[PDB]
Amino acid sequence: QALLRILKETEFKKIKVLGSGAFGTVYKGLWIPEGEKVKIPVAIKELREATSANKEILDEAYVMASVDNPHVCRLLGICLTSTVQLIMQLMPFGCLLDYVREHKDNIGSQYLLNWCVQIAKGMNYLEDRRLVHRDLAARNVLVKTPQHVKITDFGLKVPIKWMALESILHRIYTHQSDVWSYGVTVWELMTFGSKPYDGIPASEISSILEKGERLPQPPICTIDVYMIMRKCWMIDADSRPKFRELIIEFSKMARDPQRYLVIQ
Ligand SMILES: *CCC(=O)Nc1cc(-c2c[nH]c3ncnc(Nc4ccc5c(cnn5Cc5ccccc5)c4)c23)ccc1OCCO
């Protein structure tokens, strides 16, 4: 439908690099829609050129453009050339992982718990849309303003350290495996961006989980918060919390944040 703009190459301009990796490159730039009198700051993700589908691509992009939730990034436009370029609003404070690392000495309990609520709200919305994210992590949450974050990079180097055991062993991905990744994401935030299982080879992680070991209790977390994170990492997928429950629980904690996180 009319939710997704097919952009002409003249309608957007790459100005600065925001970041790059094996996926491709993201640029800060401007969207200059034809016949309008406006220049809109945007991010442009240019995927690496694929050797191998235009109808199929527009079909997936149409889904990314149809999400309508304050905590889920929405695709604004696409440009199909030798490459796929995806355009969305600029999120000026960057990814939440780097934001929490850079600002750790200045982040208090209310901020942290609000982020947990907002991420759970976005994932519950994706679940309501029958969309499984498959790569939720603090690096894939973007910061529009310090207390408005949004999930990105659904619909698009396997992220073993964020994966539910059944995803590692059987390539099963469900909303309940997303809940596992949500637990890991909360752990990243509560450790001010520490690396999960730091220094442990990816291929060792399944034996850690099989033995019953989990990521450790972050110093600032009271047992009530850590218990929620542990429940996200149950082997039985159906015994993990639902995102709806996570919203309610983190919303309750956000109402009395110093009862739940202990931050010097
Ligand atoms: C945590 C490290 C990191 O990710 N660094 C990083 C940040 C950005 C970045 C900074 N400000 C931004 N504003 C808006 N978008 C992005 N990135 C981004 C992410 C996903 C995108 C983008 C365009 N299209 N997609 C996919 C998508 C869009 C909408 C819905 C679903 C999916 C733009 C941004 C950029 C690059 C960065 O580094 C990358 C390697 O670490």
Swiss-Prot record:
Subcellular localization, as worded in the UniProt entry: Cell membrane; Endoplasmic reticulum membrane; Golgi apparatus membrane; Nucleus membrane
Described function: Receptor tyrosine kinase binding ligands of the EGF family and activating several signaling cascades to convert extracellular cues into appropriate cellular responses. Known ligands include EGF, TGFA/TGF-alpha, AREG, epigen/EPGN, BTC/betacellulin, epiregulin/EREG and HBEGF/heparin-binding EGF. Ligand binding triggers receptor homo- and/or heterodimerization and autophosphorylation on key cytoplasmic residues. The phosphorylated receptor recruits adapter proteins like GRB2 which in turn activates complex downstream signaling cascades.
Cross-link (Glycyl lysine isopeptide (Lys-Gly) (interchain with G-Cter in ubiquitin)): K16, K37, K55, K211, K242, K252
Entry annotation: catalytic residues: D135 (proton acceptor)
Subunit record text: Binding of the ligand triggers homo- and/or heterodimerization of the receptor triggering its autophosphorylation. Heterodimer with ERBB2. Forms a complex with CCDC88A/GIV (via SH2-like regions) and GNAI3 which leads to enhanced EGFR signaling and triggering of cell migration; binding to CCDC88A requires autophosphorylation of the EGFR C-terminal region, and ligand stimulation is required for recruitment of GNAI3 to the complex. Interacts with ERRFI1; inhibits dimerization of the kinase domain and autophosphorylation. Part of a complex with ERBB2 and either PIK3C2A or PIK3C2B.
Effect of E9K: Found in a lung cancer sample
Domain Protein kinase: 12-261
Outcome of mutating D256A: Strongly reduced phosphorylation
Modified residues (N6-(2-hydroxyisobutyryl)lysine): K45
Post-translational modifications: Phosphorylated on Tyr residues in response to EGF. Dephosphorylation by PTPRJ prevents endocytosis and stabilizes the receptor at the plasma membrane. Dephosphorylated by PTPN1 and PTPN2. Monoubiquitinated and polyubiquitinated upon EGF stimulation; which does not affect tyrosine kinase activity or signaling capacity but may play a role in lysosomal targeting. Polyubiquitin linkage is mainly through 'Lys-63', but linkage through 'Lys-48', 'Lys-11' and 'Lys-29' also occurs. Deubiquitination by OTUD7B prevents degradation. Ubiquitinated by RNF115 and RNF126. Ubiquitinated by ZNRF1 or CBL at different lysines in response to EGF stimulation; leading to recruitment of the ESCRT machinery and subsequent degradation in the lysosomes.
Disorder named in the UniProt entry: Lung cancer: A common malignancy affecting tissues of the lung. The most common form of lung cancer is non-small cell lung cancer (NSCLC) that can be divided into 3 major histologic subtypes: squamous cell carcinoma, adenocarcinoma, and large cell lung cancer. NSCLC is often diagnosed at an advanced stage and has a poor prognosis.
Binding site for ATP: L18, G19, S20, G21, A22, F23, G24, T25, V26, K45, M88, Q89, D153
Result when mutating G24S: Found in a lung cancer sample
Family classification: Belongs to the protein kinase superfamily. Tyr protein kinase family. EGF receptor subfamily.
Record protein name field: Epidermal growth factor receptor
Effect of K45 to A/M: Abolishes kinase activity
Impact after mutating H133L: Found in a lung cancer sample; more sensitive to gefitinib than wild-type
Mutagenesis or variant effect for L156M: Found in a lung cancer sample
Tissues and organs where the protein is expressed, per its UniProt entry: Ubiquitously expressed. Isoform 2 is also expressed in ovarian cancers.
Top-rank taxon, per record: Eukaryota
Part of the intact protein present: 701 to 982 of 1210
Listed result of changing L131V: Found in a lung cancer sample; more sensitive to gefitinib than wild-type
